[PDB]
Design an enzyme around this catalytic site. Structure first.
Site, PDB file in Angstrom:
ATOM      1  N   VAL A   4       0.836  -1.176   0.000  1.00 35.95           N
ATOM      2  CA  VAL A   4       0.000   0.000   0.000  1.00 35.95           C
ATOM      3  C   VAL A   4       0.878   1.235   0.000  1.00 35.95           C
ATOM      4  O   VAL A   4       1.808   1.319   0.787  1.00 35.95           O
ATOM      5  CB  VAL A   4      -0.953   0.017   1.290  1.00 35.95           C
ATOM      6  N   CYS A   5       0.562   2.202  -0.861  1.00 36.72           N
ATOM      7  CA  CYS A   5       1.169   3.514  -0.811  1.00 36.72           C
ATOM      8  C   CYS A   5       2.699   3.381  -0.912  1.00 36.72           C
ATOM      9  O   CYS A   5       3.182   2.647  -1.787  1.00 36.72           O
ATOM     10  CB  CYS A   5       0.629   4.276   0.405  1.00 36.72           C
ATOM     11  N   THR A   6       3.468   4.044  -0.044  1.00 36.24           N
ATOM     12  CA  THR A   6       4.913   3.975  -0.094  1.00 36.24           C
ATOM     13  C   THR A   6       5.475   2.637   0.348  1.00 36.24           C
ATOM     14  O   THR A   6       6.696   2.442   0.260  1.00 36.24           O
ATOM     15  CB  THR A   6       5.527   5.130   0.666  1.00 36.24           C
TER      16      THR A   6
END
Lengths: 226, 226
Positions: free
Chosen positions: A99-101
């Protein structure tokens, strides 16, 4: 029982983790682990205190591994113990997700080399030096790798995983039980839809972090080059 | 600093809380509290361990109070200490909010009498005996009361609160920073859109809980009648 593990680290963005956790924990015959170097308290970037349930050494072989994002990603990108654990689990996992970074951590571990992937919009330039093929889409699949954007990407992709691990009816039942039908009151969740003035403010606020992560990424890429 | 409080209780549905928490904690000049009878560990219905930060007695006057839902709602509906705390805070709060079955707790506290409100679809019949005007909509506002449905209702309404407490640009900036743009892979988040066979399975699985909550609701309504 299907074994699902989340990496839980200091300065995690907790919603990246807690969203998919609650969805997946709703399924029958799943066991969910919160993994860190030892069991015990881990503090999220907001100050929320969470509790890791198992250590790297004691974690069972996982069917699904999920790496959340957050401020704390920078440290993880240069944590050889964490990177080694991720590589070991990824070798046999049915699904490797972020997820995300969190995808930057997969990148530092070497798992994006030659793979299509995404990450948070403000950090997207850091994918190419880690060997990825950068893609500007919300969910990107490449084989058993699934990278997603947005603090709630894991909720959406958890429903996909439910459908593939079990069946579509099971995924639909969980969605209905949770009455999950989002309807954001604004449309500013992408730099392509937000007002330019808002994009500028967000970019400026991310600038110091991006600068630091450029440095970290280059060191991580050097390790991959060796 | 704007003071925002979440009630944190055993057997909470943690995402109901952790979603809005991470959104609101992203705002400047906010302090977020996790409230229970004393600080310390509280276990969510999934087994996730969270940590309450303040007691009822030590909690500051809140500007926003939010009641999450979960299995544990049944016990709270008959917890006189918790109900008294909610009533005290609601008297001066700028916003009184709930997610999912958290509105049943507001109902037991007497705060829905004559008010439009919603709750989880499987429990919606329990609103009328608590004095509410039941409404089948995802977010229902009545004065300073805001009740929402869906495990992530609080993420969406947190953006509304951000816009009203601060301004629209601030809410948009937070949305963009979080890259929040959900896209569920199925459309089964309401009994009106899910397949009939899925609705039946979900209803059957909720039946025991509904039966128990009918009993609790009637006792709670008797207390309001006195």
């Amino acid at each position: 029982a299907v074994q699902i593990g989340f990496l839980l680290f200091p300065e995690v963005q907790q919603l990246d983790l807690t969203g998919p956790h609650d969805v997946l924990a709703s399924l029958p015959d799943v066991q969910v682990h919160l993994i860190w170097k030892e069991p015990g308290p881990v503090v999220a970037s907001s100050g929320l205190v969470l509790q890791a349930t198992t250590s790297f050494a004691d974690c069972p072989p996982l069917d699904v591994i999920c790496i959340p994002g957050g401020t704390g990603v920078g440290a993880l990108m240069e944590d050889p113990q964490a990177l080694a654990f991720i590589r070991q689990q990824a070798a046999r996992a049915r699904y490797v997700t972020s997820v995300c970074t969190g995808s930057l951590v997969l990148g530092a571990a070497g798992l994006l080399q030659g793979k299509r992937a995404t990450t948070h919009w403000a950090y997207h330039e850091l994918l190419a030096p880690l060997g990825a093929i950068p893609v500007h889409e919300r969910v990107v699949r490449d084989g058993n790798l699934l990278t997603g954007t947005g603090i709630t990407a894991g909720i959406d992709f958890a429903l996909t995983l439910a459908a593939e691990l079990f069946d579509a009816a099971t995924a639909q039942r969980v969605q209905l039980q949770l009455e999950y039908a989002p309807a954001p009151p604004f449309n500013a969740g992408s730099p392509d839809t937000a007002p330019a003035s808002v994009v500028q403010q967000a970019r400026q606020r991310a600038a110091d972090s991006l600068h630091k992560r450029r440095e970290i990424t280059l060191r991580a890429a050097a390790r991959l080059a060796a």
